Structure 1
């Protein structure tokens, strides 16, 4: 059937399984996504969990079959979101030293 990204993303947000990935508003319209830049030493694949989740979810990534590739999972997650109408990028807290991340918000 293949998941559509917005409904899928919203579900992850509601379940709140991944960390650094949740609703940052009680009305539910703004949300955070970890985004530790790739070159940083403290950066593991645990910091690309949503990106990885999406890849596993769409069949792109299958642990065992393909080597894990972090940059691709991220560029893929990002491009999918950009084209999505009714959803804009708010603040770019990506290079932020302690808690690097981004908040997306649904608009009309």
Structure 2
């Protein structure tokens, strides 16, 4: 019911399995993974690219339960960002004025 699969390995798995067309290890040897994120919908509309992950956050991070509480995706969006400010081994890189004409995702370098 309330287990702790751990986000670090949860991502190492999703990234290795390549469940989202864009999220994946750019350099798995040094553990570098990049996700596309919902750069399009900053709230809740064009946010289906990473919604399967973002939505799983509520169940994977043990925060929302289907049948007992309300499935609010608005907070799930913020939950995703908290993970980026966590695990003292992740380096987020979304570019600033160069790679901004194709996708502009968030490349995260994860240490061991």
TM-score, normalised to structure 2, is: 0.68
Residues 1:69 and 2:69 aligned together: no
- Kindly indicate whether the alpha-carbon contact (under 8 Å) linking 2:93 and 2:107 is maintained by their aligned counterparts in 1: yes
- Kindly indicate whether the alpha-carbon contact (under 8 Å) linking 1:36 and 1:100 is maintained by their aligned counterparts in 2: no
Note the C-alpha offset of 1:26: 5.1
Note the C-alpha offset of 1:44: 4.0
CA distance in 2, matches of 1:41, 1:54: 15
Q: Which runs of 5+ in 1 are unaligned?
A: none
When the two chains are superposed, the root-mean-square deviation of aligned CA atoms in Å is 3.1
Q: Where has structure 1 moved over 3 Å in runs of 4 or more?
A: 39-42, 44-47, 61-68
Computing the radius of gyration over CA atoms, which structure comes out larger, 1 or 2? Answer: 2
Q: How does 1:1-108 map to 2 (within 5 A)?
A: 1-25=3-27, 27=29, 29-37=31-39, 38-39=41-42, 43-63=46-66, 65-92=68-95, 98-107=102-111
Number of aligned pairs? 106
